[PDB]
Amino acid sequence: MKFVDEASILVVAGDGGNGCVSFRREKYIPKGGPDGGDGGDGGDVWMEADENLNTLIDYRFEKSFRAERGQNGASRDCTGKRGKDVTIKVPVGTRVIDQGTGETMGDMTKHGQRLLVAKGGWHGLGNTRFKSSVNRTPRQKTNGTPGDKRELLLELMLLADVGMLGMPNAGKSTFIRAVSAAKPKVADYPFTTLVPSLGVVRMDNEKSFVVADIPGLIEGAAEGAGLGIRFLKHLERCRVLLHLIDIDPIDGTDPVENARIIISELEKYSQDLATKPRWLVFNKIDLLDKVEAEEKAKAIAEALGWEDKYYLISAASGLGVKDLCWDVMTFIIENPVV
Amino acid sequence: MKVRASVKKLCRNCKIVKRDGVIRVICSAEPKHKQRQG
Amino acid sequence: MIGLVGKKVGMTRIFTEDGVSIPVTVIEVEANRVTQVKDLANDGYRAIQVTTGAKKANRVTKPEAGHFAKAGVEAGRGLWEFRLAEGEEFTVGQSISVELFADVKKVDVTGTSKGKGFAGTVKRWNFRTQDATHGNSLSHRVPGSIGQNQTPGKVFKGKKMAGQMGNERVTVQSLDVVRVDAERNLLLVKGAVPGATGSDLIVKPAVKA
Amino acid sequence: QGKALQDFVIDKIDDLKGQDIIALDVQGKSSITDCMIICTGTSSRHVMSIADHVVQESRAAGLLPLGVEGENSADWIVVDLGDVIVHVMQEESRRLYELEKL
Amino acid sequence: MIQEQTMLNVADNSGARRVMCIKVLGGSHRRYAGVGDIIKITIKEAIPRGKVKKGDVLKAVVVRTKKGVRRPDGSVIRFDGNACVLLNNNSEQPIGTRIFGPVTRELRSEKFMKIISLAPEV
Amino acid sequence: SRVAKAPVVVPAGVDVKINGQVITIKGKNGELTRTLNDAVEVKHADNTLTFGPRDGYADGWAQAGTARALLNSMVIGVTEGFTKKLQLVGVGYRAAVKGNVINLSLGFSHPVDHQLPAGITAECPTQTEIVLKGADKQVIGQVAADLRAYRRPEPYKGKGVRYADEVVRTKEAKKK
RNA sequence: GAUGUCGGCUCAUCACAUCCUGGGGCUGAAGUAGGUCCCAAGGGUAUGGCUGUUCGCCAUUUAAAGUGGUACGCGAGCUGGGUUUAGAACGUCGUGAGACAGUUCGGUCCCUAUCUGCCGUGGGCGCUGGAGAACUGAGGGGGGCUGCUCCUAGUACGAGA
RNA sequence: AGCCAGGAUGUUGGCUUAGAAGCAGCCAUCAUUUAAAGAAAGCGUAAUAGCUCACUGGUCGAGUCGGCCUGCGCGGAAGAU
Numbered sequence A: 001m002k003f004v005d006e007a008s009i010l011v012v013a014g015d016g017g018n019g020c021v022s023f024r025r026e027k028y029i030p031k032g033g034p035d036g037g038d039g040g041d042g043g044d045v046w047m048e049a050d051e052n053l054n055t056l057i058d059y060r061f062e063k064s065f066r067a068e069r070g071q072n073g074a075s076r077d078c079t080g081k082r083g084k085d086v087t088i089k090v091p092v093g094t095r096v097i098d099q100g101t102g103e104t105m106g107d108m109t110k111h112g113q114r115l116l117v118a119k120g121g122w123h124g125l126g127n128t129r130f131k132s133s134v135n136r137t138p139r140q141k142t143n144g145t146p147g148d149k150r151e152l153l154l155e156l157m158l159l160a161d162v163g164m165l166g167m168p169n170a171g172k173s174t175f176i177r178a179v180s181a182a183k184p185k186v187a188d189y190p191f192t193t194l195v196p197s198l199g200v201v202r203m204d205n206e207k208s209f210v211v212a213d214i215p216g217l218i219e220g221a222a223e224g225a226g227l228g229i230r231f232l233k234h235l236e237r238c239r240v241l242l243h244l245i246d247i248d249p250i251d252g253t254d255p256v257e258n259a260r261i262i263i264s265e266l267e268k269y270s271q272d273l274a275t276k277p278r279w280l281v282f283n284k285i286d287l288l289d290k291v292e293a294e295e296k297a298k299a300i301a302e303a304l305g306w307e308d309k310y311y312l313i314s315a316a317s318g319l320g321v322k323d324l325c326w327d328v329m330t331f332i333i334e335n336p337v338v
Numbered sequence B: 001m002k003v004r005a006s007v008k009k010l011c012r013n014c015k016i017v018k019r020d021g022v023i024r025v026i027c028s029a030e031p032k033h034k035q036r037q038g
Numbered sequence C: 001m002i003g004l005v006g007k008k009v010g011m012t013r014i015f016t017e018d019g020v021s022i023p024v025t026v027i028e029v030e031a032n033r034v035t036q037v038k039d040l041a042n043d044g045y046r047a048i049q050v051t052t053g054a055k056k057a058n059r060v061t062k063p064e065a066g067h068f069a070k071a072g073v074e075a076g077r078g079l080w081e082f083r084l085a086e087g088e089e090f091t092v093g094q095s096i097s098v099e100l101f102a103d104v105k106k107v108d109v110t111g112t113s114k115g116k117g118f119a120g121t122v123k124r125w126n127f128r129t130q131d132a133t134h135g136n137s138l139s140h141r142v143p144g145s146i147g148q149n150q151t152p153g154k155v156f157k158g159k160k161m162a163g164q165m166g167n168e169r170v171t172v173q174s175l176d177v178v179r180v181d182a183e184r185n186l187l188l189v190k191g192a193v194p195g196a197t198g199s200d201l202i203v204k205p206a207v208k209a
Numbered sequence D: 001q002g003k004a005l006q007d008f009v010i011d012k013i014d015d016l017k018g019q020d021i022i023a024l025d026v027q028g029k030s031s032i033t034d035c036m037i038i039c040t041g042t043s044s045r046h047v048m049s050i051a052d053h054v055v056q057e058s059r060a061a062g063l064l065p066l067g068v069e070g071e072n073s074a075d076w077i078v079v080d081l082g083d084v085i086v087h088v089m090q091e092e093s094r095r096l097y098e099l100e101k102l
Numbered sequence E: 001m002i003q004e005q006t007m008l009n010v011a012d013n014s015g016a017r018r019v020m021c022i023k024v025l026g027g028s029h030r031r032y033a034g035v036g037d038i039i040k041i042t043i044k045e046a047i048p049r050g051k052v053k054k055g056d057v058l059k060a061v062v063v064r065t066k067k068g069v070r071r072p073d074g075s076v077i078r079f080d081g082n083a084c085v086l087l088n089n090n091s092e093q094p095i096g097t098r099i100f101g102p103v104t105r106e107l108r109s110e111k112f113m114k115i116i117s118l119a120p121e122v
Numbered sequence F: 001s002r003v004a005k006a007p008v009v010v011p012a013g014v015d016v017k018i019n020g021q022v023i024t025i026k027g028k029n030g031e032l033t034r035t036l037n038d039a040v041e042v043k044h045a046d047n048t049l050t051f052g053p054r055d056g057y058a059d060g061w062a063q064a065g066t067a068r069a070l071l072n073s074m075v076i077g078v079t080e081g082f083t084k085k086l087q088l089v090g091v092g093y094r095a096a097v098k099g100n101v102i103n104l105s106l107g108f109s110h111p112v113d114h115q116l117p118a119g120i121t122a123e124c125p126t127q128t129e130i131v132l133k134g135a136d137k138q139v140i141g142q143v144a145a146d147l148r149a150y151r152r153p154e155p156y157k158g159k160g161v162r163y164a165d166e167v168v169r170t171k172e173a174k175k176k
Numbered sequence G: 001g002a003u004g005u006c007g008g009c010u011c012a013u014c015a016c017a018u019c020c021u022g023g024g025g026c027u028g029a030a031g032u033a034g035g036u037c038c039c040a041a042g043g044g045u046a047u048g049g050c051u052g053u054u055c056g057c058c059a060u061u062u063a064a065a066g067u068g069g070u071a072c073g074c075g076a077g078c079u080g081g082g083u084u085u086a087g088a089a090c091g092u093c094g095u096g097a098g099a100c101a102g103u104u105c106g107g108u109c110c111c112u113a114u115c116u117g118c119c120g121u122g123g124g125c126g127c128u129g130g131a132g133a134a135c136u137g138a139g140g141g142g143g144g145c146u147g148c149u150c151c152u153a154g155u156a157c158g159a160g161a
Numbered sequence H: 001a002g003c004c005a006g007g008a009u010g011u012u013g014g015c016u017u018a019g020a021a022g023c024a025g026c027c028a029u030c031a032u033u034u035a036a037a038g039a040a041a042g043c044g045u046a047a048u049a050g051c052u053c054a055c056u057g058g059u060c061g062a063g064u065c066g067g068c069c070u071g072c073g074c075g076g077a078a079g080a081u
């Protein structure tokens, strides 16, 4: 369901098989020889990238994934079977990090790409493998090489096409309800949402886009002491970054000051988000019953001076929801670079 | 439910009952404490 | 309800209006006459004894002649009993026709299958023939092993080997009836029935769904 | 139904914005049908949507389709409406499979 | 019938000429493939410029059988040569763009309309 | 045992007949009869019913107190009656009663029909509300369990049928 | 005082510490699909390349290609590839004859069933006068496998997939 | 042991804290009228709420609670004709 990154996984490669110290005795042959089958190769844990997945909810409990013990070498030159490979379903774009001198082993690129994370243990050679002129009755046995005990950290970035950035007083969460059916928590208090949530806007069967709402940020969010600026990491992948500004906020009462305060820490996260074409729309229009609604819209739009196309919408019900979505999708078409 | 030779009251809300000649533990709060084979 | 007893005359196909060919078996049924009706008081179970066809007077001996004369029925090829279904009733001497099969639409046919004589293990139990080459000596259609070593030390009952095959009662269930003829006394049943041409067959309404 | 399903299918496809509608009156060249309709699909999802739309309306019309093929892959999907086969396929599939031969 | 290790011809212009039915699909202990069936083939002879190469393993659909096809009226459809249409491994769709030769009506019953539509015969 | 130390009192208009080890509490709300264990004795007395065991029985007072409990519910059911409350939560969940049969629609592919005992009646004040009226607590409890067993609630969304006073576990589950 | 061994073929049977199908509990069980545990032996439980191979690796299916016992089942049922008497050769050891739980080439698999057992089929007698039929059933045996598609329903669930 | 009630007063205790009002973090943990109330153990709310707990009152009315020694039992306990 929801989008949660920063998953951790523990994976162990299958231990290699164990040979057996056995000797062959037949009907007429008391001295047959060292006849002990070698062990089986240990299981191998694999990585698989699927287009369908876009979240790591299945790995927030960090289960321990076990590759089965390699089959022990049986007597009478019976080689044990190798353990079956373990494949973990992973989305596209995840980062692979080890705990302790960890590095990026590989980045998921396309569907079906396979990455090796831990190679299984080698099989244990039986007494058949150590007979020679020096020693003719080998009693020595080799333990299979142990599997790889590795700690894995999975980092995933947001795959949404539209990202939202606005104050907690702005109707970011309630706008998802007007454009989709996702049912996030909506209430009259600051910082209602704690983690980013997804939403898909499907007005037609042929064409659709994914829009995600991001938890609100405050004046002091730039340096920290709140939720920080870490939730803007799930950006730079969205084609367009919709911006919501609360007209005549109930508890803000400073529309001019807080309108430009978003850009303050936007210009200070890491590189000012490369100044991607973020739009600018207002919300809570139904609160202003009449001509006063858009009369203040131009007054607050001239303060920014951007002067580009602005949309007057109300996230409560309709009133620009059905037409703003088309323009958002229109922007998507001509720009296919993610 | 877990089935094991040793059965004990894991939490304060575990009742030990003898059903059909075997020892069982019933947890009214939540069903993770169900045991058998006492 | 009860069924009928008749004789198979052969097999023939039936062409439908859409061109589909239905291979059917043609069974002639003579008007069966009830020779006895059983009751709980006397025998403890309800059944009716019927006969079909005709038998030569010289071949018919006195014991069964009195049996036929008691019911007022002439000689018959054989005698059979059909179990009643808790509410249906028949009287002694009543002739049984064939039109009652106009609604069952599913019949069960029992008869003595063809006799194949002493059949081998391969033919009877559908065993696997051993290799005919690669050094094989005097063992092609032999059964092979028939048990384990001395620990069992015997051959279990019901073990599959050669013996008399066929010439026994065989039941084929859920056979569709195609057409029934009253004035000609023919019954057309879809599929193949056990036995050879001219053998006696017992047809009953299907017991399964 | 005859000479009426020809216009019925075209109306249903055009109801969902089909492009380059062509009707081939294969009266005797083919031994399975009487006429054929080939239509283009803008995208993979559009092709599936067109196929579902024509099948669903056919059931309400009173004719059950005999089957469809291009379900998993939307490159080319066919619908068997009895005497009429209707092909809806992507932009690429109409050139690799050149359907002007019949 | 059609069983494993059987030389097979091609009824399409994918690029192959002679393939090997070497595994028949449908269930456990599958012995034979009828006229409409999914089989696994390996390329034994193909044009170098064709869409497929030598040694490739993929799925095929039978089209014509030596033994024949039993119609519901006791009529058989015999043929001189065994042919198949090549399909992609993941998705059962024809690879070739044309069908060369007659095709039985039985493929219509099993919802194989790609072969039936672009086949200039039965 | 010690629960049986408190004899029960029957209200006015309640007739009690003893014919050995069978007890009848027939009255305003129907007629019912129960056979005993042949080991506990009830003595006819003033307007109060007492219980006692037989000498020479190992169980003794342990099982005698059981009759004191069941007979207590008998007088309640014949004068006040027994009420069982079941409610339906979830979309597509409807309940209706036609005579002696409750009609159920619980997201299945076929309607569910239940046949009630002779002395059990059910009413549907709301499409998602069924109330069971009976004279014996054991019978209505079995009936309520039968209704509950079809769609026992799951702890993720709570969909299913439940008692009015029953509290069910709620889980915030998120994975796969 | 003796062919008798491993593997393969034919034929199987039994146990459940259950591979699938069946019934459930818990879950870090949204659903499909999985993790673990309990009951359950009715049925079913793969084809090829390599090697003699059992076992394995590989290719491709299936719901699965279960674990073991039965003189590591079964050679008075078959095979004789492995090993291997007598021949010969290579490497090594020894002066040598020769040897080597080192390798390579070739190298006789007998039996007409007495008894128990089993598969079928008969004669004698009995069942209390004899005979001809037709049945109830004390008991015994056979069979019990399952894939895919559609409707329910793109419904419950799920932001969507 | 059940049942019916009470279970606050400065006081949202101070700091960090968007939110720490007892139950995300630390600290002191003293002290008020009471038969009793701990800035306090668990559920829940981001936090308020909303449920308990420690403890007290009333009806009910006679044994109740938890340690030892000993006899006989229960599970632990699945294999092949």
Ligand SMILES: Nc1nc2c(ncn2[C@@H]2O[C@H](COP(=O)(O)OP(=O)(O)NP(=O)(O)O)[C@@H](O)[C@H]2O)c(=O)[nH]1
Pocket: A167, A168, A169, A170, A171, A172, A173, A174, A185, A186, A187, A188, A189, A190, A191, A192, A193, A214, A215, A216, A217, A283, A284, A285, A286, A287, A313, A314, A315, A316, A317
């Ligand atoms: N009438 C009206 N009220 C609105 C509208 N948009 C928001 N509101 C009101 O203002 C409140 C703002 O809260 P909310 O929308 O949940 O904020 P948010 O998007 O969740 N931001 P954050 O996650 O940071 O708390 C809403 O709960 C609602 O009461 C609107 O268009 N019309």
Ligand SMILES: [Mg+2]
Pocket: A171, A172, A173, A174, A192, A193, A213, A214, A215, A216
């Ligand atoms: Mg929000």
Ligand SMILES: [Mg+2]
Pocket: D053, D056, D057
């Ligand atoms: Mg429609």
Ligand SMILES: [Mg+2]
Pocket: D071, D072
């Ligand atoms: Mg589909």
Ligand SMILES: [Mg+2]
Pocket: none
């Ligand atoms: Mg869909």
Ligand SMILES: [Mg+2]
Pocket: none
């Ligand atoms: Mg489907």
Ligand SMILES: [Zn+2]
Pocket: B010, B011, B012, B013, B014, B027, B033
């Ligand atoms: Zn517990």
